[PDB]
Scaffold this active site. Sequence first.
Site, short mmCIF file in Angstrom:
data_model
loop_
_atom_site.label_atom_id
_atom_site.label_comp_id
_atom_site.label_asym_id
_atom_site.label_seq_id
_atom_site.Cartn_x
_atom_site.Cartn_y
_atom_site.Cartn_z
N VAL A 127 0.80 -1.24 0.00
CA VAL A 127 0.00 0.00 0.00
C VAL A 127 0.83 1.29 0.00
CG1 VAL A 127 -2.18 -0.93 0.88
CG2 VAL A 127 -0.37 -0.20 2.52
N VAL B 214 5.60 -0.41 2.62
CA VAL B 214 4.55 -0.75 3.60
C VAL B 214 3.43 -1.60 2.97
CG1 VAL B 214 3.60 1.57 3.30
CG2 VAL B 214 2.80 0.14 5.18
N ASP C 297 6.67 17.47 11.91
CA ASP C 297 6.17 17.57 10.54
C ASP C 297 4.69 17.14 10.47
OD1 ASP C 297 6.33 18.15 7.76
OD2 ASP C 297 7.15 16.17 7.27
N1 LIG Z 1 0.12 5.07 0.42
C1 LIG Z 1 -0.09 5.56 1.70
N2 LIG Z 1 -0.26 6.86 2.03
N3 LIG Z 1 -0.45 6.98 3.40
C2 LIG Z 1 -0.39 5.79 3.97
C3 LIG Z 1 -0.50 5.29 5.29
C4 LIG Z 1 -0.39 3.93 5.54
C5 LIG Z 1 -0.47 3.41 6.94
C6 LIG Z 1 -1.59 2.69 7.35
N4 LIG Z 1 -1.68 2.21 8.58
C7 LIG Z 1 -0.71 2.39 9.46
C8 LIG Z 1 0.44 3.08 9.15
CL1 LIG Z 1 1.64 3.25 10.39
C9 LIG Z 1 0.60 3.61 7.86
N5 LIG Z 1 1.75 4.33 7.51
C10 LIG Z 1 2.60 3.87 6.40
C11 LIG Z 1 4.09 4.08 6.67
C12 LIG Z 1 4.37 5.49 7.17
C13 LIG Z 1 4.15 6.55 6.07
C14 LIG Z 1 5.30 7.55 6.37
N6 LIG Z 1 6.33 6.75 7.05
C15 LIG Z 1 5.83 5.59 7.51
O1 LIG Z 1 6.45 4.73 8.11
C16 LIG Z 1 3.56 5.79 8.43
C17 LIG Z 1 2.05 5.61 8.19
C18 LIG Z 1 -0.14 3.02 4.50
C19 LIG Z 1 -0.04 3.43 3.20
C20 LIG Z 1 -0.15 4.81 2.88
#
Ligand SMILES: Nc1[nH]nc2cc(-c3cncc(Cl)c3N3CCC4(CCNC4=O)CC3)ccc12
Lengths: 266, 331
Positions: B27, B35, B144
């Site tokens: 995703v 992720v 941020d």
């Molecule tokens: N395409 C995408 N846009 N927004 C997104 C957010 C997620 C997401 C969903 N659930 C839980 C978490 Cl924790 C998620 N994330 C992803 C990983 C992240 C994004 C910045 N750095 C990270 O480590 C933190 C939020 C996944 C896919 C997504």
Amino acid sequence: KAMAGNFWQSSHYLQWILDKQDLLKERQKDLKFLSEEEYWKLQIFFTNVIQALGEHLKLRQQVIATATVYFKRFYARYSLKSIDPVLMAPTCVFLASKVEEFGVVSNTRLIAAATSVLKTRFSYAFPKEFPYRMNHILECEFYLLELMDCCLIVYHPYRPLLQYVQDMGQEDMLLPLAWRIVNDTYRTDLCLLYPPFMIALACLHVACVVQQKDARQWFAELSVDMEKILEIIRVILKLYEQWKNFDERKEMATILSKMPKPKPPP
Amino acid sequence: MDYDFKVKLSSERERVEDLFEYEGCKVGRGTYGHVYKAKRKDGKDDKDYALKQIEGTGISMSACREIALLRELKHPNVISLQKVFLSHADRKVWLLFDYAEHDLWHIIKFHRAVQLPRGMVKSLLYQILDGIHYLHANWVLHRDLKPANILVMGEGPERGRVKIADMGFAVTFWYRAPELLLGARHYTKAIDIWAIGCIFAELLTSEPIFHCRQPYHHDQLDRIFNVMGFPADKDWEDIKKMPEHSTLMKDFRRNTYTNCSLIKYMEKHKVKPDSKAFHLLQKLLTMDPIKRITSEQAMQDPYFLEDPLPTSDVFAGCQIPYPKREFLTEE
Ligand SMILES: Nc1[nH]nc2cc(-c3cncc(Cl)c3N3CCC4(CCNC4=O)CC3)ccc12
């Protein structure tokens, strides 16, 4: 000052304050090779190696303390033959340095510190040069982080000691000695057995007796289990008697040779 | 290393591939790594998890700090680390979080393309404030804050719960406080609060309040002054102490912005200047960081006691019209 007042919901408290019986049960495997006496002497030795590594690298005392806690946690659970403590000592300092926001201590600087500290300050124990390279530190780091269950934030007695001596209004008189005594507590198991504030109260108490300062009322006015504090004072007094009677430099080559050795591959 | 110890650990080590099904469920891909929307292979758990393989190898400063902090933080409105997998052969690190189907970037975008309901905006703001208050109380700054990082849970037992993500553990400037743009050398709690004020405005109007075409960024400051007006000396006395203060004086004249005010901007977007909403927003969007409200004071604001009260589920038991996350290719 990240997570500074979270101790009671922290991983340190909930997972890494250990029961004394379990600690001494897991230690019986190493006590087939070493006596109890020799085991506490090894702990003093490797505490000093870690302090010397931090001093050489110009790291703050808190970072040295965290590195020391990591090292102790590893060998609370595993035998001394699992990973060479000569490898583990600098690994702990490397990992703690990344946590404590100083820097990813240069790979060449970590190895040079390890080589120079053992040559210059521990030649009585180590006649051969430091045999490990950065790929060995990197492998060890992964093992260490796994055993600690990624529990990296460690609370120490330094912060509450400073708060207590400020409340007394006795910072200049008592702080230097109480601080050095907290450093000395890392030669023992205390940091695995009691919360840091209790260790700071024990060290402050010993500093008050050494300097002949009556603080009976102040200690009376605290909401704390003094039986637990007196247990800690008793270990602190015992460690200075151990210190007196121990010549690290005469004994450590022989004690290190008695450590259990790792099995090679088949 | 002892051989018996090595094989026992390799035998008993939980491996991400064995415990979790994530083939073709990517995703997200970014500087953070990869992720996936993963489910347990064992079957006892039915929930989706967000499974991140961190970018690079080993354990960097940023990875170390992220693991160290997420391992300690525990609050309903901050996204929580469930598990860490260390893959030894390739020195890759995997983090398992709770899965959030939605976020404010996608939610606001759905409404900008049908107004964002005002019960939902209040509930979102409150949970954002609650989460940041928890972090600030533990001396953890986000650094941020923006809609992309304010995640919201989909269907399940945490339906409509805000989950704050992507804290600064170790281009566009629409959410950056004016002290950062004038050369401030340190992140503060106040900088997070300004960003929360920007998000709240955007939730009310569907438009980023300081939208600007792509430390000192002239055009971004111009947009803040076109919205807010140019700060009088009395409003921000220590503006003179900002490193870029003379650059500001060189490039800008206060005359330019004499018909500009937050009241006038919000009136254009059908937000009444007598509303509790507006008074709260103006406290969050105060130019002088020392005159900016704190997260705790904001949570006590009478906006949150006015009908409608905030709800735990920001959708209020209503149907979620927002689309689920798109799967990506492994390329
Ligand atoms: N395409 C995408 N846009 N927004 C997104 C957010 C997620 C997401 C969903 N659930 C839980 C978490 Cl924790 C998620 N994330 C992803 C990983 C992240 C994004 C910045 N750095 C990270 O480590 C933190 C939020 C996944 C896919 C997504």
